[model samples]
Target: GSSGSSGSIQKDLANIAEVEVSIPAKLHNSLIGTKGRLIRSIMEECGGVHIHFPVEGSGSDTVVIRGPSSDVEKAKKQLLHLAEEKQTKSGPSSG
Candidate 1:
């Protein structure tokens, strides 16, 4: 999606998801990985999905995951569960 009509042409050709998630800024790098390999695997495993990050300098907290309904829902749930699990593991001591 174009952010305020900037003509940046930032569309993913492999979009298949119908879910959006706002990951904590600190966990963003973990999701995207060093070279995006983990993110790529997530997409492939979820069936032709696409994960997109907002343009740099934009304070958007969401990561858009696009894919088919089945795949998207499964992946969305998995990602959310992972986040919740991590929070649980970190316990009350860590934020």
Candidate 2:
């Protein structure tokens, strides 16, 4: 018999989870998307998961996410993926 299914668990794990992510500082602004336009969209899409970042120009690359487990997971991965895209684009310096 061939297998074709997926399973999931963690009954009491659907609530309040803290997820921290570290991405390059350069990509921070890209993900933040000009005064949180993209950030707000992401959070709203993720059920309003709390998302914050270190003060701009603070030289910190750590991104913080807190909210429901599912929301956290979605936000983290999606944010990481977006960051990855920016990383791939490489630094654009000078006109």
**Tens digits of per-residue lDDT for model 1 on 5-95?**
5556756665343679877755666656799876677778777677777644677778787768788887777666655444544444422
In the range 10-68, model 2's lDDT, one tens digit per residue, is 66644688889888778888888878888899899879988878876678888888898
lDDT at position 11, candidate 1: 66
lDDT of each: 0.68, 0.82
Model 1 residue 4 lDDT score: 71
* Clash pairs detected, candidate 2: none
lDDT of 1: 0.68
Per-prediction TM-score, please?
A: 0.62, 0.72
Task: Give me the candidate number with maximum lDDT.
Answer: 2
- Clash counts for all predictions: 5, 0
